[PDB]
Structures are given as structure tokens and as C-alpha cells.
Design a protein around this nucleic acid. Structure first.
Ligand SMILES: Cc1c(N2C[C@@H]3CCCN[C@@H]3C2)c(F)cc2c(=O)c(C(=O)O)cn(C3CC3)c12
Ligand SMILES: Cc1c(N2C[C@@H]3CCCN[C@@H]3C2)c(F)cc2c(=O)c(C(=O)O)cn(C3CC3)c12
Ligand SMILES: [Mg+2]
Ligand SMILES: [Mg+2]
Ligand SMILES: [Mg+2]
Ligand SMILES: [Mg+2]
Lengths: 487, 247, 487, 245
DNA sequence: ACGTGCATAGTCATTCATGA
DNA sequence: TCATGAATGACTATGCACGT
């Protein structure tokens, strides 16, 4: 039996825990803004074909696929992660198209796995766009059976768009969501002004990203906290719901709350007001009624007493309830396997760097494949030019190897090309098909020229990111939800 | 007559309505937590209350009374309806003048319906006699036309009809997404439930009527009673002709 | 609002429940001895490729696949059914190869879905043997997206082998498991004596099927109950565990129980004795100690007092515990969609009928496919004889449609055959390759003649069932576990 | 000698031996693993106490709240000894306390939480060498003809694979080397032949050298002061690999 | 009254960091 | 003390028929 000192054991084990949690659980990768479970769920659904071009698969199949191949953990918590990515009040830009009961902003829990179906959203398809073209590094999974992606292509800035919140060890992250169109403008500037230093870039990006854009709409009061977050990586952003005072024909006035700040439970909010009333904490309130429905959305009516001023009661609500509540921003993300608090300019830049990497790698892959097909096509054309000879040769061969060996000798061909000639069907010996082979060679050589041009010119590379992103934003971009007001 | 609704002595599972008038109030007794959750969201909280029932309801015909009263789900129903049971029944204290039973269209939903109807007929019969008990018919299909509004069908025949009519009208459907088939209430969201089973302007309700009480009594005792042989012979005798009851 | 009478509603709804539960939930199909959940799990695993020729897949993937395609019910109970089919103390011949903690014969529950892996067993592969050759009717699943099997090929009598227990409405089934080798002999006799009446057949089959063979070994006392079950479809079979009296150095005696009757919980059994001793119902017992382990199996040591007779205590155990307990046989199974209590000869006969159906359908499928291949091959041979013309024709054709239409006219060929000529690779124009087409035609025509011969001869059909089953039994048959003794 | 249950935790699968000196308590992570352990154990000398979920941090949590925790009560009650000043090693019901967690990171975390409980409430158990750590297997090499081999590290896996292939043995490239991602994936037999069979199990005895140095380390890593822990990790995680070089 | 097996998921307690 | 969000599932109750 080997002896081990408690200090050695404690230090090693806990550090191992802190590090795995930090890098591989609780905190997002800066490039795609995803935690491991998110990335693995999405890729599992993707590889399974659970895409918008087909009907919703039972969500259990997504959980099981994620569990069985990539994520060596429990089915329950994986389902929770999949579910959250489908809630429009959780994600600013949902990555999962949920079918069925996925819960509500209140205490109504999501239906069990058995009752729900799920597939990837169109935007999530942009997260995975051209992932099969060697655009990202793959590694063996938890048992070496299959490969999984280290990071997704992420053809839109998902970290900033959807934000991220995570509790790790020794640190935690809390990045708010943002408006995709505003982020795109920041990216577009970063691409145009690719040589700009950090000071200029921060100034430019902060001008275009006006502030967080929460899925729950609401209000942002002030500008200091937002500025602090972008310049420091830490900032306190004051959020408010929306209140509309209504007057009765001949009764009392009432406050109608139609929006709440980000991550405020509707039921807890109502309960908090109700409990602070009977305890004499919010006098002036006469009655609390939840007139909310699936058709009118959030609608909490707070009838106030006649000897009470509406503005006084609202300020009391701001003070003693989450009608006014702060978002504690802490812009923490994993950069190159290291946890780092980032300025807004750093977040954009790192993303732009990732996009350029993706496009260059994609181009390299396509160029290699283009060369391979061209290589084979060159062989086919040689066969067509001497078609009479090709057939006669193959006929006299005892095997296919003698026939192939001859083809090399006849037309000066590789083994790959000769094999391709051998695999050729009589289908393609028709006139138009022979011409199609010719034109196809001409097409690829043209594509190769284009591809070569891209690799040699950083200008085009940045242009590709711009144009492709612009296309995504035009299609999937939406209006701002959270309104920004002054003090 | 008016009675207080719970708002922050009634079942915890009950999502009560706001209206204090039973004559205008409705209780949706729902199968499952999932369906009950969506119903709680899609309902009209003014007049419609939700009481989700979890698992198969206890057979009051077989189990002795003391055991039935200890059952959490039965207690929820009795407490929510406000009325007593048996001799202590008082319809004046009825908290909802519409008691809608909403179960899955599947076979197990039918079973739960018979168990609930057995509870009502044995403990609170006047609710049936005075037409306070209803049956909600859930949709079976949702036709998702590419450009037009989606249509719901409550039978295979109606699905075929709406499909034919729409196609004849020049509308088109994806052969992938296409016609969503519901296998239970739990698969529906809040909106879907409203537009098919809870919106009073489109919902398909069936009112349970009681004609021959003596004949009802014997049928209940045969189907739900402790006597297996009687039930076995009844099924083998009448299952052959179940299709032809309404022909 | 439509009115409906309570009597109509009650009758209609309950009958609908009773019938589906009877035919489509609780009771086994006589042909494969499977309930719907069993059949759907096995086919799901099969179609997923979760077979013994590959590593165990995570059991969650099997549950999810079963849920998403075939079985519209909860994941939990589906997992329970999968687990049971993997327990050697539940199934006499397990259909699922489980990897991990699948519980014990006691109160130790199986591990959660996340912790276990599972695949089909070799015998389960015989349940599904050649299911893809139209050997069984398929129907659309619960939403019509895909097809599922109505019944499995079941190339060994699974109903009798593994037995079945189920609670339906108005009725219940309780068929015990049997020894595969004994069942095989019964099947072999039924095949040889295909004209024997029910009277003779019952006598023969009862001679070969000596009685139920439980996975938990133990003892069968008497022969009447077994006879009743086989002749009536109902009988009470007395089971016993195995007790071995041990003496001590002091001279104290102890009873060692190493086996228990079928479906007796080990922990409940120990607890029952413990409770029957403290109350004062099994005097003579001094101490109860469970010396069981994974290495020695069941081993319950019952130390008895010095003033106690071993057999007296054993007889008391037989009387007051499940050390001796009866199996209530009720041979109920679904036959052609109808619940029926069956004699043993009927069970064998109905299975043999199913096997013959499988073999004839398989042969028909193979015969149809063989003709299709022959049909196309004949087309190719015609092309080879006029190869110079065929190629010249395709080349001189402006399109492939012109070429195809021409080929039809040139060689007097179908469009399917003509299409095959077009699809032909330049490989197949080599000398030896031309020869294989000729020989393959000759090869298939021999196969077609053989297949036709099988369909024309009931003798061969029965012979195939016999030989194929014999092969299965030789490989997967095992010794008897339950010992049969007289009064 | 002390009585075994046949006034202790319901989750406890106690041993049969009446002698604490001969008895062992396997504190196991998870119900699944605990279930399999209960079957694969030697019921004579080995008892099983499955622990469910992350153990409460006694460094952070208030004393009264720790005592309300069902899992902590199970441990304290099963060990028989008191806690803090009321600790009495004489009442120790098992002279071997084996902590058995998954080889994964959350198992490492649970180990630190358990070691924190022991060091703060029942330190003498550590000082007198009654606390041990079981090392679960990581791989199971399934040779086509030969008996299966277990490996407790990537290096050993590579070695045993090399040796076997050199010896003429062969493995399927499908089934092949089964990799354990936790105790819950193992059955009774596997657990016995790797972590519970005393003739092959790899146990590590926890020793306590400098009590004062241990005290501050526990307080840094497990305490409420985040800053101290954050800086400690950023300071020492860089060199965690080289602690035993 | 208990076992059987296929059907009809929410609740329960911790780690971890931060701000109310 | 509470919320956040990915990590570490056993227990709880009915239907249904049948035999001790
Ligand atoms: C054990 C466990 C829980 N229990 C642990 C506690 C100690 C013992 C008494 N039971 C309480 C509650 C729980 F409340 C939730 C979950 C989960 O939500 C869950 C999940 O997968 O989400 C998994 N587990 C188990 C693996 C540990 C959970
Ligand atoms: C409700 C339910 C159970 N209980 C019945 C009671 C209903 C009212 C109050 N809650 C308890 C909880 C249960 F003990 C097990 C299961 C299951 O095993 C199970 C399963 O899927 O196996 C599904 N359910 C629920 C759908 C009904 C179960
Ligand atoms: Mg959970
Ligand atoms: Mg249902
Ligand atoms: Mg269950
Ligand atoms: Mg683990």
C-alpha cells in the first residue's frame, strides 16, 4: 500500500477540478461563445441530421446522441441544456427549434424529454456552416471512437449575440446578449480598419454596439455601466421593466407591467410584490392581478390606492423589487485555453480572427479538393481524345490491372486517373456527357484560379467574411428589443 | 353565489381562475403535468382553472372508501370542486359549473376518462345529472400549409378532408414537416391547446348526459367492479360491436 | 355542445382500453412470444446496428431510438423493459447483452440509463434473422414516417423458451420458460409428423418437453401441474429451492440454501425468514446469515438449534416461506390478433406454422430478386454479343435518352435492362469481366431453379426449418437448470 | 467488537465481521457504483456506504447546516466516532475507510470534500492512517483468447497492450479496450477484481505530515475567500504536473 | 396483502461566485 | 438567503389479474 500526503492529494485533485471546470465546463470559448455541452449538443443534432430541412426529431434522440458519443454525463442535465437553448426568453438568438412545452419565463417547468421534439435553428446552422470542410480542428471523443469539433465555425458572433453566464472555480462569467445587427457593424468596421490599434478599435466598436440587447426587452437606464463593461470587462448595467399607468373610468389608477428585466422570474416577481404588501412594505398598492396570457404576453396589473401617487409607487417598486435590477457584467471567456477578461474590442477582434481562420482553412480545403477532381478530369479528357484506343486496350486484358497498366502507358496517366477511367460508366460516353466532362474541367480550373486568388489576397478574405456575414444578418437579423434611455 | 380563488386551503396543483362566479368559471381536469403546464399557460386565467392529474386515477369501484379518500389525486378533485361526496354533496358549493375532462386521444386517456367518470358517478352524481361534466376532444393532426394558416383535425377522416380541400384550393404542404400528429396533450404547447380545446369559440366539448341511472349503475359495476369474470364476458361479448354503436 | 350518454362513453372507452391492452401491450404474440415493447426495442437496436459484432452502444441510444420511431411512450418504462431482457435471472435466454450494473435477483435496483451500455445477443439475432427479406409483414409506425415489423422471424421458439407474464384487462398470462433443446425436439417431431392430429401431437410433444426450465434452476416437485398446464393451458407447478445440510466442528448443523424458485426475491426471502423467527413461527432456527457473493452465488446459511431436526426445519421453510412456492401457469397468448388459451401442441404447431411461413416468404423474396438479377444479366449478355454496335450507338447518341431508346431497339431489350447497360462501367468490358457476367447468369439460373424447387416441395421447406433450427440449438442450446423430481 | 445491522444509516450495507480491526468501509460515489460494490464486495469484512451528490463543504457551510445534511450524518453515524471534541477513536466501527470515487474530475472534487470533512471533524482518522483512497481502473483490455487485463493509467494501457501483442495475443478493433468513465459503468465482478479484492486492489493511505500547513491549504482551497483560492490556482496550477517529479 | 411487467415524472440537496 | 447554469437519480402511486 502506497502512502500519500493529504496536502499533495488535496492540491492536485482540486486544481485538476478547478482547471477542467474553468476551461471545459462553466466558461465559454471566445471564438464561438459555447461551453462544451452546448457545442456537443449542437454538433450531435447536426451530425444526426436534425436540421431545419426536416421535421423535429424527438429530443431524447438528441440527448442520447450527445450522451453516447460526445458528452459523458447524465441525460437529465443535458436535456436542460438543450431546452435552455430553445427558450426565446433565455437566448437572444435561440440555437434550438423546440416543438412542445419548453416552459415559461415563470415557474412553469419544461415538459419531460418524452414529450418534446427538437431540431437546429437556421442560425445554429450558421454556427455549423461548412464545419465539414476542415474549417475547425477535430479531436477524438471521450473514448476515441469518433471525432468531435474543438470549436464551431460560428459564422455569426455568438458569444456577444447570445451572451453567457457561468460559475466556475475561483472565477465566473456573465456576458450579456447583444443585437446581431449592431455586432455586425462592429465586425464590419474591424474588417475595414484591420490595422487600427486597440484604442481606436474600442472607440469604434463601442459606438456601434450601443449596449446589451436582452431577449426580454425592457429598459437600460444610464450609460456608465455599459461603458465600464466594454472598457474594463466589468460593469453594472441597470435594467428596468416597462410600466404603463392606466386610469379607470371612475375608479383608481393602476400600474401595468408588460416587460421585465433579463432573467427575472415572472412568478417570483409577482410573489415578491405580494409578500411585501401584507408585510407593510409597499403601501399605496391596493390590488395585484396577473392578467397575463399566451395572447397578450406579460401583463401584471397593480391597482394603487387613491391617496397614492403612481410615480411614488413605481419608485417603491424599483427600490424593493426586481422591476429595477442590475446585470453584473463580467466579460470572462476562454482564449486559447486560458480564462481572460476581455474588452469589447478584444472580443470582436478575436472573433474576426476566428472567422478569417475559418475562411482561409475552407479555401485551402476547397483548393485541395478542386485540384484532386481536376487531376482526375485531366485523365478523363485524355481518354476521350483517344477513346477508340482506350476501349480496345481494356478488352484484351486478362484482369483490370493489365488494362490499367496499359492506360498509364497509353496516355501517360497516374494510378488514380486510370482507376477513375476504369470506374467510368458507359453513361458518360454520350455526346453531351463527353462535352460535360470537358466543360467541367474548364469550370474547376476556373474555380482553382479563384481559390488561389483568395489565398494570396487578405483583402478578399476579409471581403468574404463581410459579405457572408452581411447575408446572414440581412436574413436572421432583427430589431432591437431593449430600449436604451438616459438618467 | 361567489367564492374566493387562491392567490398567494386548496390543492397545490390547482391553477385557479380569477373570476369568483362559478356560473362563468371552468375547471379543466388535465392528464399529466406537461399538458397541465401548457394548459395553465394557454388558458384564459379569468374563467378557466387547471387541475393536472398525475398517473392513473384510483378505481373507486374497487378500492374501499377510506383508501380512496387518502389518495392525493382524488382529494385534489374533491377539494377543487368544493362539493362534498355521497350524502354530504351540496351542489350550491360547486366552484365550477363546467368540469372539463381533458385526456390524451390515446388509449390510456380513454381509461383515465372512465376512472374519472366512475369517481363522479359514485361520489358526486348530480354533477353529471345537471350537465356540469364535459369531455374535451383533443386534436390528432395539425396541417402546416406553406403559406396559409395551419389547420387542426380531430379525426383521420377530417385530416383527409382538409388535406384534399386545401390541395384542391391550390395550397401546398411540405412532405417533411407536413402534418404533425399529436400522440398526447403533453406534446402540445400553450397556443395549440388554446386554439383547439380551451378557446370556447373553437373548442369541441361533449356534455356527459345520464339517462338510465339503473342501467348506468350496472354498467359501472360490470366494467369497473371487482368481478373479473363479469368484465371478461362483457368485453368478449360487446367488443365485437363497438364500431357499430352509432351506425 | 354535443351531448353524449355516460353509458355509451364508458362502454366505448373502456372496451377500447381493454382490447388494445390485451392485443397490443400486456400479452405475447404466439409466433415470437413478444409483447410490442419487446419487439420494438429489439428491432430498434437491430436497425441501429447495435449487434454483437460491434461494441455495446449506450443503452440511452436504444431507448431513444425505440421512443422516437416505434414506441410512443416514456423513456423510463422502456428502459425497464430493456433491462429485464438483459437479466439472466429473468430471461432463460437473454435477448439483450447488458454491460454494467443491471441489478440483482434481490432488491438491488439496476443502474440508471446513463451508466449502462447494451446490444443484442446472438439468440436475439436469430429472432431477427432475415427480417429484411420480407419474411414478416411490416406496417407504418405510430406517425407513418417509417415501417415496423408486426412480428419477428423468431428462428427459435421464444415464447416457450423465455416464457411470458402479463396482466391485461379481463385476463392475464403466465407462461413459464423452457429448455431450448427440449423445445427443439418437440419442433423436430412436429415437422416430421406434420400430419399427426392434436391427440397424437400432444402426446409426442409432452414426452419431449419434460417441463419448464427456469433460469434460477431450483426444483420441480410432481408432474401433475406440468401435465395440467400442457393439456389444459392451466396448471399449478410446485417449485423448490435447493437445500444442503452442513455439519460443524462443534457438531452444530446448518442449512445452506444455494437456489430459489423462479421469481423469488432473495432479499425479500431473507427478510421473510427473519421476520418469521423474531415473531416466533420458525423455531429451531438459531441464526440467519447471508454468505452470498458474486463468486459463490446464492448462499443463505440457516444455523439450527441442537434440539432441532434438519428436515423438520426445511419442511417448515417449505410451508411458511417461498423456498417452496407454486408457479401459476396460464398459457395465454395472442393468436391472429385474438387472445387464446393454448395446449402445448397448439403452441408448438402455431410456432412451426410461423417458421414455415417465414421460410416460404424468404424463398419467394429470394426468387423474385434472383429473377430481377437474371433479367438484367440477360440484358448485359446481349450487349456483349453486339458490343461493337452498342458502344458505337451510345457514342453517336447526342443524349443518354437517345442512347437508351436506341439500345432498346438495337438489342430488343427492356428499359430497365437498357439502363443497366448504360450504368455499366468500362471495367466490365475486360475479357475476364465479360466472362463473370456470363458465369453469374449461369450461377443465378441454377439458384432460381433451386428456389423454385423449394417452393414446390413442402418436404424441403420443413427440412430447412429443421436444419436451420438444429444449427441454432447446437450453438446456443444449454443444459437443463431446473431439476425435475417425483413426490 | 461492535454490532452490525441485520440505529445506522439506511443506505449503509454493513459488513458481517464483528471486529472493527478486520472491517472496512467503502465510501462510494453514486448509487449505481454503490449498488455494484454491495454485490462484488466480500460481505464478511467490507461494508458499503454510497454517497449521493456533491458533499457539503464543511469549510464554507455553517456547523448546524452540515449536521442537517443527510450524507454527512450517514458518514458520521456509520464511522461510529463522534466529531471535534466529542471524537472517540475507540468507537471507530471500521479501521479501514476507503474513499472510492470516479477517476474523472468530479470524483477528485468529491475526494477533496470528503477529506475536508475528515480533516475538520475527525482528524485522528487521518493521523492514524485509517483513511485510504481506492484507485479505479481506466481501461479493460479484452483479449480474444486470454483473460482480460485492467489498466489504471494511459501508460499502463500502452504497456500491457504492447506486451500482449508482442506475446502473440490479439484484440478486436471493435470491442477492444473498454474505457471506464466512472465506477457506475462497472459491474460487481469488475469492481471486485480491481478495487475491492484485497490481493489486487490499489489503495493509497492518506498521511498527514505538517498539520499547520495542511490547515492553511484546506482553508485556502475550501474556504470562502475566493481571491485567495483564485490566486492560488493561477499560481500553482501551472506546476501541478511536477509535484512528484 | 404481496409479487409480477408494461403503461400513466416531479421533487429532493449539495458545489461554486456574486450581488442583492 | 436567492437567483443564475452545467455538474454530481432514487423515490413516490395508481390500473390490471391472479395466486398464496
Ligand atoms: C442525487 C440527486 C439529488 N439528491 C441528492 C441529494 C442528497 C441525497 C438525498 N437526495 C438529495 C437530493 C437531487 F435533488 C437532484 C439530482 C439531479 O437533479 C440530478 C440530475 O441528473 O439532474 C442527478 N442527481 C444525482 C446524480 C446525483 C440528483
Ligand atoms: C406519477 C408517478 C409516480 N407517483 C404517483 C404519484 C402521482 C401523484 C403524486 N406523485 C406520485 C408520484 C411514481 F411513483 C412513478 C412514476 C413513474 O415511474 C413513471 C415512469 O415513467 O415510469 C411516471 N410517473 C408519472 C407519469 C405519471 C410516475
Ligand atoms: Mg437535475
Ligand atoms: Mg398519452
Ligand atoms: Mg416507472
Ligand atoms: Mg463521474
Amino acid at each position: 500500500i502506497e502512502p500519500v500526503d493529504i496536502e499533495q492529494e488535496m492540491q492536485r485533485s482540486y486544481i485538476d477540478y478547478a482547471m477542467s471546470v474553468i476551461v471545459g465546463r462553466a466558461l465559454p470559448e471566445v471564438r464561438d461563445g459555447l461551453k462544451p455541452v452546448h457545442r456537443r449538443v449542437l454538433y450531435a443534432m447536426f451530425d444526426s441530421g436534425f436540421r431545419p430541412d426536416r421535421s423535429h426529431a424527438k429530443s431524447a434522440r438528441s440527448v442520447a446522441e450527445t450522451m453516447g458519443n460526445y458528452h459523458p454525463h447524465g441525460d437529465a442535465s443535458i436535456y436542460d441544456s438543450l431546452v435552455r437553448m430553445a427558450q426565446p426568453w433565455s437566448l437572444r438568438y435561440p440555437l434550438v427549434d423546440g416543438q412542445g412545452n419548453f416552459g415559461s419565463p415563470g415557474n412553469d417547468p419544461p415538459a419531460a424529454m418524452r414529450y418534446t421534439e427538437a431540431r437546429l435553428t437556421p442560425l445554429a446552422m450558421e454556427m455549423l456552416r461548412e464545419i465539414d470542410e476542415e474549417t475547425v480542428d477535430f479531436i477524438p471523443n471521450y473514448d476515441g471512437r469518433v471525432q468531435e469539433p474543438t470549436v464551431l465555425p460560428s459564422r455569426f458572433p455568438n458569444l456577444l449575440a447570445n451572451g453567457s453566464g457561468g460559475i466556475a472555480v475561483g472565477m465566473a462569467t456573465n456576458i450579456p446578449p447583444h443585437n446581431l445587427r449592431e455586432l455586425a457593424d462592429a465586425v464590419f468596421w474591424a474588417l475595414e480598419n484591420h490595422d487600427a490599434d486597440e484604442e481606436e478599435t474600442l472607440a469604434a466598436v463601442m459606438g456601434r454596439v450601443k449596449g446589451p440587447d436582452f431577449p426580454t426587452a425592457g429598459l437600460i437606464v444610464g450609460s456608465q455601466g455599459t461603458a465600464d463593461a466594454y472598457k474594463t470587462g466589468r460593469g453594472s448595467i441597470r435594467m428596468r421593466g416597462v410600466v404603463e399607468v392606466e386610469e379607470d373610468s371612475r375608479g383608481r389608477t393602476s400600474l401595468v407591467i408588460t416587460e421585465l428585466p433579463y432573467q427575472v422570474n415572472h412568478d417570483n416577481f409577482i410573489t415578491s410584490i405580494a409578500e411585501q404588501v401584507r408585510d407593510g412594505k409597499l403601501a399605496g398598492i391596493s390590488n395585484i392581478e396577473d392578467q397575463s396570457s399566451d395572447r397578450v404576453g406579460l401583463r401584471i396589473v397593480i391597482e394603487i390606492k387613491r391617496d397614492a401617487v403612481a410615480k411614488v409607487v413605481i419608485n417603491n417598486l424599483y427600490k424593493h423589487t426586481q422591476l429595477q435590477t442590475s446585470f453584473g457584467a463580467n466579460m470572462l471567456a476562454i482564449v486559447d485555453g486560458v480564462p481572460r477578461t476581455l474588452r469589447l474590442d478584444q472580443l470582436i477582434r478575436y472573433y474576426v480572427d476566428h472567422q478569417l481562420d475559418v475562411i482561409v482553412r475552407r479555401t485551402t480545403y476547397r483548393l485541395r479538393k478542386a485540384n484532386e477532381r481536376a487531376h482526375i478530369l485531366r485523365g478523363l479528357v485524355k481518354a476521350l481524345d483517344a477513346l477508340d484506343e482506350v476501349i480496345a486496350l481494356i478488352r484484351a486484358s486478362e484482369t483490370v490491372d493489365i488494362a490499367r497498366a496499359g492506360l498509364i502507358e497509353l496516355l501517360d496517366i497516374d494510378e488514380i486517373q486510370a482507376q477513375a477511367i476504369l470506374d467510368m460508366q458507359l453513361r458518360r460516353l454520350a455526346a453531351l456527357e463527353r462535352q460535360r466532362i470537358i466543360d467541367d474541367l474548364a469550370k474547376i480550373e476556373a474555380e482553382i484560379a479563384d481559390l488561389e486568388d483568395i489565398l494570396a489576397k487578405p483583402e478578399r478574405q476579409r471581403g468574404i467574411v463581410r459579405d457572408e456575414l452581411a447575408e446572414i444578418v440581412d436574413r436572421h437579423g432583427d430589431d432591437r428589443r431593449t430600449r436604451i434611455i438616459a438618467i | 353565489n361567489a367564492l374566493v380563488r387562491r392567490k398567494s386551503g386548496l390543492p397545490g396543483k390547482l391553477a385557479d381562475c380569477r373570476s369568483t362566479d362559478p356560473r362563468k368559471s371552468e375547471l379543466y381536469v388535465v392528464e399529466g403535468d406537461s399538458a397541465g403546464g401548457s394548459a395553465k399557460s394557454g388558458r384564459d386565467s379569468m374563467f378557466q382553472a387547471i387541475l393536472p392529474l398525475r398517473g392513473k386515477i384510483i378505481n373507486v369501484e374497487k378500492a374501499r372508501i377510506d383508501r380512496v379518500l387518502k389518495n392525493t389525486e382524488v382529494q385534489a378533485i374533491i377539494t377543487a370542486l368544493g362539493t362534498g361526496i355521497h350524502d354530504e354533496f351540496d351542489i350550491g358549493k360547486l366552484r365550477y359549473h363546467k368540469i372539463v375532462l381533458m385526456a390524451d386521444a390515446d388509449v390510456d386517456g380513454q381509461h383515465i376518462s372512465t376512472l374519472l367518470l366512475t369517481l363522479l358517478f359514485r361520489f358526486m352524481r348530480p354533477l353529471i345529472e345537471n350537465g356540469h361534466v364535459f369531455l374535451a376532444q383533443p386534436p390528432l393532426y395539425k396541417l402546416k400549409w406553406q403559406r396559409s394558416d395551419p389547420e387542426f383535425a380531430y379525426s383521420d377522416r377530417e385530416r383527409d378532408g382538409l388535406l384534399e380541400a386545401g390541395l384542391k384550393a391550390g395550397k401546398k404542404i411540405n412532405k417533411e414537416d407536413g402534418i404533425q400528429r399529436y400522440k398526447g396533450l403533453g406534446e402540445m404547447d400553450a397556443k395549440e391547446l388554446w386554439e383547439t380545446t380551451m378557446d370556447p369559440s373553437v373548442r369541441v366539448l361533449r356534455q356527459v348526459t345520464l339517462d338510465d341511472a339503473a342501467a348506468a349503475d350496472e354498467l359501472f359495476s360490470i366494467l369497473m367492479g371487482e368481478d373479473v369474470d363479469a368484465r371478461r364476458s362483457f368485453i368478449t361479448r360487446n367488443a365485437k360491436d363497438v364500431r357499430f354503436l352509432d351506425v
